[PDB]
Structures are given as C-alpha cells and as structure tokens.
Structure 1
C-alpha cells in the first residue's frame, strides 16, 4: 500500500472514524499531501498545542522555494508573512482595533442585515439556500462594513474566493488574475476621499501620517485584500457548517431558541466541533525538534489537524457531544494558538452568534430540505463547505 494521503475527507458534517484511530495509535504520523510531499500530521491536543506554541515550527518558512508543500501558494510568497509584515510596519494595534465587533452600531448592522436576508428568504418561500443566500452574504456585508467599503462592491470581491482559497497541487492562474485585480481595487480605495471609516478609512489616514511614510502602498492594499478574504471565507464557512450541526440537533436548536442567552456557549461548542478547516495548519521546522515519538527534522513540513485536537477525549471528554457547561470551553484550537492566533476571533464569534440568534427567531422550525447525504462538499479547497444548503421551515 501507499503512504496515507491527506486530507482524509472533504465532508464537513462528520469526523472520520480514522481521526480517533490515528490519534490513539500515532498522534504524529507521516502522510503525503496533494503535491506529493511528505509531512507529519499531528492529531492530539497536546502535540498540536506544542507545535503551535513553538515558533521554530514556522509559518513564514512554509513559503520558501524548494520546501515540501501542503498546497501551492495562492498569493505572493511575502504575503505568507502578512501578519509579521503588519507588525513590522507598526500597524498591528490599529488593524486589530478596526476588526473587533465593538464599533458603535456594528452589532445592530449585523442583526439588521441578518433579519433582512431572512425576510427575503421567507418571502421567496422554501426551499432556501442558507449558504449562498444567508451565511455568505452576511459575511460579505459584515466585512464591507468593517473595512469601510461600499456594500455594493462586496459581491465581486466575494467571487474571487472560490479560487483564492483553493488547496491545489499546482499554481492557479486565475488566483493571480483575481489577486492583482483586488489589490488594484484596494489601492483605489486608499485614494478615494469618500472612504473615511472602518479598517480602510483608518489605513488611509495612517498612510498620510508622517509616522508611516515609509510603509509601502503595497502593504496597505494587501491588508485590505487579505483581511476581507480571510474574514469572509472563514465566517461564512464556519456559520454554514455550524448551521448544519444545529439543524441536526433539534433538542439544542430548541434550547437555544428558548434560551438565547445560551447562544454564546452554544457557538463556542460549535467552534470546538467545527470541521471548516479542510487541511491541517502548515508549519516548516527550522530546527530538529522532538514531537512525541518523532524527531522532526529541519526543513520538514508539519500539519496541525485542528479536529484532531478539538475532538481529543483526553482534553474534551465525550468530544462529539455539544455540552454547554464544559470547564474549559474556549480552550479549543478553532482559532489557532500562539503567534498566529486568529486576529478576527471576536468578530467571528459575534457573526455566528448574531446569525444564529436571528435565524432561530425568524425560522424556529428550520430543517434540512434534502437528506444530509445530498449536500455537495467542495473539494480541493481550504475550507469544507456544502455548495448549497437547502432548508425549509
């Protein structure tokens, strides 16, 4: 037989039995990626945390020419170090302030947007597609608001994403076409005097402030493209798969409908059990480092399997169960850990909380309109998502 291939399954509605078998028998295991490279797949909570908390397992070095690769780059190689570049430019605090859910009126905007989307689905009549006509447009609208860019520019930026977040063995020509176009758009935004709010309004001011005169225009535009894309793909995909998990648990759906104060705890468990990330998080070793029974060598690729950690019964007893009273509820790895912990975590939580609260109020009888096996799972992509999510209510 051949070396075990990753990823195991593109389905986001169930974890393969194989994950628990691997975690028990070989929590760091050699695998082959879609490029043909070998990698170490890490699947226990303890070892996933170790890798994420040791910067000698480097994100930036995954972009090096000649490295073993999980998948092809979809951005210029310097952009792999995007957060590091933002920090080196003195922009980290400002970027992170702009993308919290705390700006006045933001939560109300999200509730209003969710309720409008849902009212339109009710008017049109069942079946409704909760991914294309709810979760993704909600994500897109939220990120236009957060960035300060016109709502009407959202759809075109959004349509880059089905290519931009591919997990491909080979370079993708369309990813460069869309990247270059979206960078030109964000560069125009920075020159547009009407853009005075959100992340892009703040970057536009900092760009003209003397304390940032040597930061490149390229970096300013890149922040807009990267934060829009990462935020929209992550929140739309997470909310979509969380809605499936909720729909397939009518008792929990009814509990959260009846006691919406429990929605934050419910969303935190839906984060823990989420299968949205299609691949392990990649890192390149910059030293020889012992990880469990394996001495990982300098230059080797390590893949941190989030569902490995998050379904580890040694950390989360009865891991497949949504339990709203766990003693360690935010200790999951859904947002990563360590140097590269997601800067959008609070915004992603709020997007999903508000989306679920609105859906349960408007569509308390929401259910799948097709058998669950009829959902079409996107392949060779950095997220697991169903192409359509047909529901009735």
Structure 2
C-alpha cells in the first residue's frame, strides 16, 4: 500500500512545501510524536526519535507491507542487507572517491566554462540538472558518445517502458566490460564478491538503475537549493565563500542540513515497543522526518538560521543513519563541493531577479517541490 505522505502536512502552497520551516517548528513545539489518523501513520520530528527509527532495525524494519515512496536493497534489514550492501559498496571505495575528484572537476570546469561570460544564468538548466547526470555517466564508464539526462527524466506506465529501454542500452555494455575491465563503477560491480557470491550481468544493470534513482535527482535538488540559499537566505554567505575559498565543504554541509526538503523515510514496527514514548504495535508505520529533525534546537543551535560554522552541522540526518546510511554520501558531498568551487572561481557576486516568482517555478517531485527554474545575475571581478 503506497502511503501519500503529501496528505500529512497538507501544505497551502508549493512555496511552503519547498521550505516548510513554519510546519517543522509547529510539529517540534506542539506535536513531535504525531499520529495521523487519515494515513494511519506515526510521525516523528525530534532528532533522537528520528535517529532511533532510522537505525534500530530490530524494532523499525525497512521491509514492511506499506511505504511512503531490483535488488530491493533499501527494503532489506540485516542480515539479508549485508551481502547486497557489500557488493554495491565495492564501487564506492576510498580509492574510487579519490580518483573521481579530478574527473568530476573536469566536468564542472566545462559546465561553468559554458556560462563564464553570461550576465545572467539559470542554475537549473546550466548546472543543477545536467551536472549529476554527466558525473554518473562518466563514473559508470558509459561510452564517451552517450555521456543520459533523458533517462532519469523518463525514469520518473511511462516507467515500465523507460526501464526496458535503459536495460537494452546497458546490458550489452556490462557484458563488454566483463571482458574489458576499467576504473569505473560497472567494472567494480563485476569484480565485487561476498562470501563467494557475485552479481550477474542482469543484476549489475539493475544496480546501476538503483544508483541513478538514488543519486541524480537528489543531488540536482541539493545543488539547486544550495544556490537558492545564496540568493534568499543569508545573502552575505556567497561573499564569505569568495573571501575564503576553503569554506566550500562547510557551506555544502550547512545546505544539506538547512535547504534539502523534504527528507522523510518510513519504517514498519517489527516488535511492540514504547521507545518513542508512545506504545507502538508490530505492523504500525512510522515516518521519520529528517529535514524537521535537522532544525531541532536540542542538536542545532539557532537552527532556523544559516550558520556554516555551527560545529554540529555534520550531525544532520539528510543521508540517514545506521545500516541504510546513504552509500552515495561522499560522492554527493564531492559533487556539491566541486560545482560550488568551480562556480566561486568564475563569479565574484550573484543576485536574484527582483521579479522572480517562486510559486510558478516549483513542480511536484519525490522530495515535495523542486525548482523548474532559478535565475540569477552574475558578475566577474
């Protein structure tokens, strides 16, 4: 049973759903452990409850009958999760993340080089939408000619057709790489082994589709919302980053705490318990609202303000917590750092369009509402 999580807050505007800080403050102050009769869900907003739901799989299972949304990795609890996680993790080593940085830098340099003389840019079409698709295509090892945005657009049934077309495209590339191994994700998934078990070629195609669904639109949203913040939240932050070019990672971590909305994951209660202060029964569904708990003043001082120097920022739960903690988190942080650093090198100052209207430039997405357009005036020094 697909649970329509959109019906819990019932937002009055796309703009509110895009940045629901008023609703987070209401739930944290008045209703932090909230039973929603219409969806038959429990809803938790406080940092210590959200963290417990995400990680304590003995009590809060990822593999229940009801959900908020090809290996089903995200739907497995330990012990069955260990093999799937280990085989996919073979493509996300410390060595690969080190080797990816100069490749991702090249891609960012080319995207920014295309807009370097622009008086005005559109973050979405010029940067946030193409960049994570161009990156994942390079990291997969796709032929240079195919270097792909189309796929994830369509991968959003339209869905049956698109998945069958991706499969026919990639299946012969995996077979080819099995005989012709290179430093790319597909080659690392071919060589992966757990207790003598390996992926089949078909499983590797599915693994790449899971990585596309996990890592493209999420990263696009995170980048667009970071640039949104520089225009609309702390308008002095961009200047601070220009003045000290080592601050990019701190800025990325604060934009993942402050401007990624809405982050929520569901679990199914596995055993009766009152760990969240209320009696729950086996089969109950709990939604953990990570974006809300990222503004819990018990963990984050001055939580409704941008502060890239807040020493707790690295504790945000935008990537989850526990066994399912985002496999892509290092890559996501690297992509956001590299695109921000390339942008800072090109542009001395950015300004919003006085006439930009948010409501007409938001569309429904898996995370709530996403920018369709984000204009800015840019300057060079």
What is the TM-score with the length of structure 2 in the denominator? 0.85
Structure 2 Cα separation of the partners of residues 82 and 161 of structure 1:
24
Paired residue total: 364
Q: Deviations over 1:92-125 (max 9, x none)?
A: 441331895211xx322222222221221245x3
TM-aligned CA deviation for residue 79 of structure 1: 5.6
Paired position in structure 2 for 1:216: 200
Which structure 1 residue ranges, 5 or more long, are not aligned? 166-172
Which structure 2 residue ranges, 5 or more long, are not aligned? none
Which of residues 142, 150, 153 is equivalent to 2:135? Answer: 142
Structure 2 Cα separation of the partners of residues 94 and 47 of structure 1:
31
3-state SS of 1:378 partner:
strand
Change (3 A) 1:322 1:258: same
TM-aligned CA deviation for residue 37 of structure 1: 3.3
3-state SS of 1:322 partner:
coil
8 Å CA contact 2:60, 2:267 repeated in 1 = yes
TM-aligned CA deviation for residue 293 of structure 1: 3.5
- 1:79-228 alignment runs, 5 A limit: 80-81=74-75, 87-88=82-83, 91-97=87-93, 100-103=96-99, 106-123=100-117, 125-155=118-148, 158-162=149-153, 164-165=155-156, 173-193=157-177, 196-206=182-192, 211-212=196-197, 215-228=199-212
3-state SS of 1:289 partner:
coil
Q: Deviations over 1:350-377 (max 9, x none)?
A: 1111111111221222222342535522
Q: Deviations over 1:269-328 (max 9, x none)?
A: 11111234x352111111222243422221121111112110011111110222233232
Structure 2 Cα separation of the partners of residues 4 and 355 of structure 1:
31
Structure 2 Cα separation of the partners of residues 151 and 48 of structure 1:
42
Paired position in structure 2 for 1:168: none
Change (3 A) 1:119 1:371: same
Change (3 A) 1:128 1:368: same
3-state SS of 1:110 partner:
helix
3-state SS of 2:114 partner:
helix
Structure 1 Cα separation of the partners of residues 312 and 249 of structure 2:
14
Paired position in structure 1 for 2:249: 264
Please list every run of at least 4 consecutive aligned residues from structure 1 whose deviation after the TM superposition is greater than 6 angstroms: 82-86
Q: Deviations over 1:64-100 (max 9, x none)?
A: 3xx3x324xxxx5846437977742551441331895
Paired position in structure 2 for 1:169: none
